[PDB]
Structure formats: structure tokens, C-alpha cells
Enzyme design. Structure first.
Site, PDB file in Angstrom:
ATOM      1  N   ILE A  10      26.866  -2.617  49.496  1.00 41.74           N
ATOM      2  CA  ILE A  10      26.039  -3.747  49.090  1.00 41.74           C
ATOM      3  C   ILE A  10      26.265  -5.013  49.896  1.00 41.74           C
ATOM      4  O   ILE A  10      25.450  -5.934  49.852  1.00 41.74           O
ATOM      5  CB  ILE A  10      26.214  -4.074  47.583  1.00 41.74           C
ATOM      6  CG1 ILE A  10      27.684  -4.285  47.243  1.00 41.74           C
ATOM      7  CG2 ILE A  10      25.656  -2.945  46.740  1.00 41.74           C
ATOM      8  CD1 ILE A  10      27.927  -4.506  45.762  1.00 41.74           C
ATOM      9  N   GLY A  11      27.362  -5.060  50.644  1.00 39.58           N
ATOM     10  CA  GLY A  11      27.635  -6.247  51.434  1.00 39.58           C
ATOM     11  C   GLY A  11      28.718  -6.077  52.480  1.00 39.58           C
ATOM     12  O   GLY A  11      29.412  -5.059  52.520  1.00 39.58           O
ATOM     13  N   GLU A  12      28.854  -7.087  53.332  1.00 40.78           N
ATOM     14  CA  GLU A  12      29.850  -7.082  54.387  1.00 40.78           C
ATOM     15  C   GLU A  12      30.183  -8.500  54.802  1.00 40.78           C
ATOM     16  O   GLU A  12      29.301  -9.271  55.183  1.00 40.78           O
ATOM     17  CB  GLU A  12      29.347  -6.301  55.600  1.00 40.78           C
ATOM     18  CG  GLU A  12      29.316  -4.801  55.388  1.00 40.78           C
ATOM     19  CD  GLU A  12      28.825  -4.057  56.605  1.00 40.78           C
ATOM     20  OE1 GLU A  12      27.674  -4.307  57.026  1.00 40.78           O
ATOM     21  OE2 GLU A  12      29.590  -3.221  57.139  1.00 40.78           O
ATOM     22  N   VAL A  18      31.940  -4.389  51.020  1.00 42.00           N
ATOM     23  CA  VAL A  18      31.871  -4.240  49.574  1.00 42.00           C
ATOM     24  C   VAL A  18      30.845  -3.177  49.192  1.00 42.00           C
ATOM     25  O   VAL A  18      29.729  -3.151  49.710  1.00 42.00           O
ATOM     26  CB  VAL A  18      31.536  -5.593  48.894  1.00 42.00           C
ATOM     27  CG1 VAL A  18      30.207  -6.120  49.403  1.00 42.00           C
ATOM     28  CG2 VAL A  18      31.519  -5.426  47.381  1.00 42.00           C
ATOM     29  N   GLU A  73      34.188  -7.197  39.001  1.00 41.11           N
ATOM     30  CA  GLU A  73      33.155  -6.903  38.032  1.00 41.11           C
ATOM     31  C   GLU A  73      31.893  -6.901  38.908  1.00 41.11           C
ATOM     32  O   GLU A  73      31.796  -7.665  39.881  1.00 41.11           O
ATOM     33  CB  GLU A  73      33.073  -8.029  37.014  1.00 41.11           C
ATOM     34  CG  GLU A  73      32.761  -9.378  37.641  1.00 41.11           C
ATOM     35  CD  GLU A  73      32.437 -10.438  36.605  1.00 41.11           C
ATOM     36  OE1 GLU A  73      31.621 -10.165  35.703  1.00 41.11           O
ATOM     37  OE2 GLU A  73      32.982 -11.546  36.687  1.00 41.11           O
ATOM     38  N   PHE A  74      30.935  -6.055  38.573  1.00 37.87           N
ATOM     39  CA  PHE A  74      29.711  -5.960  39.346  1.00 37.87           C
ATOM     40  C   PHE A  74      28.626  -6.884  38.827  1.00 37.87           C
ATOM     41  O   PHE A  74      28.325  -6.901  37.631  1.00 37.87           O
ATOM     42  CB  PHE A  74      29.204  -4.523  39.325  1.00 37.87           C
ATOM     43  CG  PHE A  74      27.884  -4.333  40.010  1.00 37.87           C
ATOM     44  CD1 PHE A  74      26.698  -4.316  39.274  1.00 37.87           C
ATOM     45  CD2 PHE A  74      27.825  -4.167  41.394  1.00 37.87           C
ATOM     46  CE1 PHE A  74      25.477  -4.139  39.907  1.00 37.87           C
ATOM     47  CE2 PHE A  74      26.618  -3.989  42.037  1.00 37.87           C
ATOM     48  CZ  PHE A  74      25.435  -3.973  41.294  1.00 37.87           C
ATOM     49  N   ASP A  78      22.546 -11.264  44.443  1.00 40.28           N
ATOM     50  CA  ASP A  78      23.149 -12.463  45.015  1.00 40.28           C
ATOM     51  C   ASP A  78      22.062 -13.525  45.137  1.00 40.28           C
ATOM     52  O   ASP A  78      20.871 -13.216  45.056  1.00 40.28           O
ATOM     53  CB  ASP A  78      23.851 -12.209  46.368  1.00 40.28           C
ATOM     54  CG  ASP A  78      22.905 -11.793  47.490  1.00 40.28           C
ATOM     55  OD1 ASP A  78      21.878 -12.467  47.727  1.00 40.28           O
ATOM     56  OD2 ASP A  78      23.215 -10.788  48.169  1.00 40.28           O
ATOM     57  N   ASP A 119      34.285 -20.576  52.074  1.00 41.46           N
ATOM     58  CA  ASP A 119      33.137 -19.963  52.735  1.00 41.46           C
ATOM     59  C   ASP A 119      31.951 -19.724  51.822  1.00 41.46           C
ATOM     60  O   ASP A 119      31.363 -18.648  51.823  1.00 41.46           O
ATOM     61  CB  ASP A 119      33.567 -18.648  53.397  1.00 41.46           C
ATOM     62  CG  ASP A 119      32.508 -18.095  54.344  1.00 41.46           C
ATOM     63  OD1 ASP A 119      31.810 -18.906  54.994  1.00 41.46           O
ATOM     64  OD2 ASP A 119      32.375 -16.851  54.441  1.00 41.46           O
ATOM     65  N   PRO A 122      24.866 -18.575  50.091  1.00 43.29           N
ATOM     66  CA  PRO A 122      24.018 -17.866  49.125  1.00 43.29           C
ATOM     67  C   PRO A 122      24.435 -16.408  48.884  1.00 43.29           C
ATOM     68  O   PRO A 122      24.393 -15.934  47.753  1.00 43.29           O
ATOM     69  CB  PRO A 122      22.623 -18.003  49.729  1.00 43.29           C
ATOM     70  CG  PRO A 122      22.684 -19.419  50.327  1.00 43.29           C
ATOM     71  CD  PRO A 122      24.051 -19.390  51.015  1.00 43.29           C
TER      72      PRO A 122
HETATM   73  N1  LIG Z   1      31.186  -9.289  46.713  1.00 46.31           N
HETATM   74  C1  LIG Z   1      31.347  -9.117  45.400  1.00 46.31           C
HETATM   75  O1  LIG Z   1      32.409  -9.388  44.826  1.00 46.31           O
HETATM   76  C2  LIG Z   1      30.174  -8.588  44.645  1.00 46.31           C
HETATM   77  S1  LIG Z   1      28.680  -8.182  45.379  1.00 46.31           S
HETATM   78  C3  LIG Z   1      28.076  -7.727  43.836  1.00 46.31           C
HETATM   79  N2  LIG Z   1      26.819  -7.237  43.576  1.00 46.31           N
HETATM   80  C4  LIG Z   1      25.655  -7.403  44.287  1.00 46.31           C
HETATM   81  C5  LIG Z   1      24.456  -6.733  43.772  1.00 46.31           C
HETATM   82  C6  LIG Z   1      23.210  -6.860  44.464  1.00 46.31           C
HETATM   83  C7  LIG Z   1      23.110  -7.661  45.691  1.00 46.31           C
HETATM   84  S2  LIG Z   1      21.706  -7.799  46.445  1.00 46.31           S
HETATM   85  N3  LIG Z   1      21.920  -7.952  47.980  1.00 46.31           N
HETATM   86  O2  LIG Z   1      21.012  -9.131  45.897  1.00 46.31           O
HETATM   87  O3  LIG Z   1      20.779  -6.500  46.105  1.00 46.31           O
HETATM   88  C8  LIG Z   1      24.288  -8.340  46.228  1.00 46.31           C
HETATM   89  C9  LIG Z   1      25.528  -8.218  45.550  1.00 46.31           C
HETATM   90  N4  LIG Z   1      28.948  -7.875  42.840  1.00 46.31           N
HETATM   91  C10 LIG Z   1      30.132  -8.357  43.284  1.00 46.31           C
HETATM   92  N5  LIG Z   1      31.152  -8.584  42.439  1.00 46.31           N
END
Ligand SMILES: NC(=O)c1sc(Nc2ccc(S(N)(=O)=O)cc2)nc1N
Length: 277
Positions: A10-12, A18, A73-74, A78, A119, A122
Site C-alpha cells: 500500500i505504500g513506500e 508498507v 493499526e490499519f 491516506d 516528514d 498528505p
Molecule cells: N503507513 C502506515 O502506517 C499505514 S498506511 C495505511 N493504510 C492505507 C490504506 C489505503 C491507502 S490509499 N493509498 O489511500 O488506497 C493508503 C494507506 N494504514 C497505515 N497504518
């Protein structure tokens, strides 16, 4: 981690990757960050006891086989995705105000516990269906420079809590205008975009600025622009607050605690966002 079934990346960030994952034992859905020192873990171990409603909860810290995993926690989405999804109409002011207000509470909490985010952007501001927004991806002691405080760009070696207020101010403006406030693509371009808008800082508005590591007497001298043009749809209370969050001098920059008492939040409420998940 054979203890999880990675659902999707879901991220980097600069600190690692992540993934959305499911604990194959408890069945809980979490955000699993694969990172890749004792000063590090010890530092992290502090973050676990850093619990607040506007701070993403760090659930577990796992150190194994030269690998460091953090279980959070999820959260649903974002703020970057939400802003894009809201670009045609813009996020309603009451929701912008609520988010800013909650983020200031989160920062006020972090800062009172001597923790700096460093850091904010958004992408690491996470929201849920109930209207909350939380700080994620705390930074430890192609990268985005858009939210970087001017003192960082000028080579300050010791960041202060003020760098987080600056970043949040930039985010606030962006939510309001639907456009990044300072979209630089290099350190100097970033710095100069700030200068062209807020005016090239000097010793009057920022004592000590000309003696900063990367300051150059040769910087162009741009005059400051009016906030009325910088964030037009923002009412005067909002512009007043933003201006205080964007003061050049880190010492003049408003604190999270003081920002919370700003008249802008007199009518703050907690709307629920329309999230498309
Ligand atoms: N980095 C973290 O701790 C994160 S990232 C996360 N969920 C999440 C769900 C959907 C999107 S998106 N790009 O809007 O579809 C982005 C992030 N939860 C945590 N705790």
C-alpha cells in the site's frame, strides 16, 4: 513474516515498504511496515507508548533475521488519495478545519513528548470513515520536498518541532486550494518557490538566516506576496493561522498548542468524510 498474508503493497517511504496484511492467527487486518541498530529499536520502543487518537497506533515491533517489521493499526485511506478524489469539488471547509484541528492535537501530543514527525505529507496522514485523521510514518533521526521547512533546506542540523507546523501549514493550504503550495522538484527550486511566495528571508524577519549552512548572499531577492492571492478561498481567520504556521523563523512559528486556541477553530466540528474505499 509467515505470520501474515500480505494482501497488497500500500505504500513506500524512505524507511521501507508498507503492506496491507492479515494476521493469519488473529485474522486482524494491519499495516505491516518492512524496514531495513539498538538506538533505532530503543527509539522505536518509545513510539509504542506514544498513544493518542490522532497518532496511528504502533501495535508490534518485530526484530528478526536482520529485519525490522512494524505492525500498525490499519487505516482506510491516506489524505493524498482523498484530496485527489475531492479535486473537482474540494474538501468542504468544515472537514478541512476538523482535520487540521485533529492533526494539531496529534502534533501537540507528539511535541509535548519530545517526538518530532519530521516528514509530514498528505501520504502519511491517514483517515477513517468516522472522520478521524492520524499521523503515520514518523520519520526517525523520489523524495517529496514540497512540505520541507525552510530551515531544513538551508542546512539546519537540529530540527525543532516547528518543522512539523510548517509541513502541516503547507498541507492546510493544499487542502484549501486543491494545489500544492510549494511544488519544488529540487532543493533549490523548493527553497526558491518558498522565497518567491513568502519573500526572500532576511535578518529582519529571520534573525540568523544569513549565517545558515546553505544560505548564499547570492540568493535572488523576491518580495513577499499577499496571502489573499496565495490561498484565496480561505477566510481571514484561516489565513491568519496559516501565516503563523508559515513564519520563516522557527522560533516565531506558532506552536501546535497555540494554534489549537486560534479563533479559526471556534466553530470546529467533526464531519464524516465521504470515502470511496
Ligand atoms: N503507513 C502506515 O502506517 C499505514 S498506511 C495505511 N493504510 C492505507 C490504506 C489505503 C491507502 S490509499 N493509498 O489511500 O488506497 C493508503 C494507506 N494504514 C497505515 N497504518
Amino acid at each position: 513474516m509467515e505470520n501474515f498474508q500480505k494482501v497488497e503493497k500500500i505504500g513506500e517511504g524512505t524507511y521501507g515498504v508498507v503492506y496491507k496484511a492479515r494476521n493469519k492467527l488473529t485474522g486482524e487486518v494491519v499495516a505491516l511496515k518492512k524496514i531495513r541498530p539498538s538506538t533505532a529499536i530503543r527509539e522505536i520502543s518509545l513510539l509504542k507508548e506514544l498513544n493518542h487518537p490522532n497518532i496511528v497506533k504502533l501495535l508490534d515491533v518485530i526484530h528478526t533475521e536482520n529485519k525490522l517489521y512494524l505492525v500498525f493499526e490499519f487505516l482506510h485511506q491516506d489524505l493524498k488519495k482523498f484530496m485527489d478524489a475531492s479535486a473537482l469539488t474540494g474538501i468542504p471547509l468544515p472537514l478541512i478545519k476538523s482535520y487540521l484541528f485533529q492533526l494539531l492535537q496529534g502534533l501537540a501530543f507528539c511535541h509535548s513528548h519530545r517526538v518530532l514527525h519530521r516528514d509530514l505529507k498528505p501520504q502519511n496522514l491517514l483517515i477513517n470513515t468516522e472522520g478521524a485523521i492520524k499521523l503515520a510514518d514518523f520519520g526517525l533521526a523520489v523524495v517529496t520536498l514540497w512540505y520541507r521547512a525552510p530551515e531544513i533546506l538551508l542546512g539546519c542540523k537540529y530540527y525543532s518541532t516547528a518543522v512539523d507546523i510548517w509541513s502541516l501549514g503547507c498541507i492546510f493550504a493544499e487542502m484549501v486550494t486543491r494545489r500544492a503550495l510549494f511544488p519544488g522538484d529540487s532543493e533549490i527550486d523548493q527553497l526558491f518557490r518558498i522565497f518567491r511566495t513568502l519573500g526572500t528571508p532576511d535578518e529582519v524577519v529571520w534573525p540568523g538566516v544569513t549565517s545558515m549552512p546553505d544560505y548564499k548572499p547570492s540568493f535572488p531577492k523576491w518580495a513577499r506576496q499577499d496571502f489573499s492571492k496565495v490561498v484565496p478561498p480561505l477566510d481571514e481567520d484561516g489565513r491568519s493561522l496559516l501565516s503563523q504556521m508559515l513564519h520563516y523563523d522557527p522560533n516565531k512559528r506558532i506552536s501546535a498548542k497555540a494554534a489549537l486556541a486560534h479563533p479559526f477553530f471556534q466553530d470546529v466540528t467533526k464531519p464524516v468524510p465521504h470515502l470511496r474505499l
